[PDB]
Amino acid sequence: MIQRTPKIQVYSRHPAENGKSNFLNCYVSGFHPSDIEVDLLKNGERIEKVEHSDLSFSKDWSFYLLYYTEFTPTEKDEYACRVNHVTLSQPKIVKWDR
């Protein structure tokens, strides 16, 4: 058996074909086992509608998840990604910078 704690990165991107659109992204990387729970949060509340959840693996024991959706951030709102995995004794919450 092998188990590996996910690396978690939270960031925003504008698709170049539609620059007015903005996406909030949580990239959860290099984890094992694949069992996982991942949410985007707005002001502590789970965002229910997340349009994209893309899972892949490299080696059989290394998984990668890109979890993202369109959003409209204001200066006041706080966004975060919350991840639960067997390697994390408590949920890990990573704040979006900006």
Q: Which residues bind Na ion (CB under 5 A)?
A: 84, 88
Least distance to Na ion, CB of residue 18, Å: 37
CA distance 96 to 77: 10
- Cα three-residue angle 89-93-96, rounded to 5 degrees: 160
Please report, as a single letter, which amino acid is at residue 84. N
Residue whose CB is less far from Na ion, 42 or 92: 92
Residue whose CB is less far from Na ion, 38 or 88: 88
Least distance to Na ion, CB of residue 7, Å: 16
Least distance to Na ion, CB of residue 4, Å: 14
Q: What is the chain's length? A: 98
